[PDB]
Design a protein that fits this description.
The structure is cut from a larger assembly and holds 2 copies of chain A. Chain A is mostly beta strands. Chain A starts with 19 loop residues before the first strand and ends in a 15-residue tail after the last strand. At the A-B interface, β1 and β2 of A face β1 and β2 of B. Chain A: This is Lower collar protein. Chain A: It comes from Staphylococcus phage P68. The PDB classes it as virus.
Amino acid sequence: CITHEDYLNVVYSSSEVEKYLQSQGFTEHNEDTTSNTDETSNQNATSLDN
Amino acid sequence: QNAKRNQNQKGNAKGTQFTKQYLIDNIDKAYDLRKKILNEFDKKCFLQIW
């Protein structure tokens, strides 16, 4: 009654086992408001002398 | 024109590793995990004479 039960499958040719679990959560939000204002004017001084 | 933006944002991440190693000489240290508690009763609770 001791736990030195290494009578089968002695793998100590080092055998480094890894694990790498990885989760990720991500939300996002935007609010993009523009507002234009624009006005024009001109003048059209024309002439013709037939 | 004017323009205003509001980029609200959040993240999350939950990593986890479970790396086990198996050096060879740990069983040498594990030979007597129960021996030094079992003879402790011989040291302190039982008549150590014939």
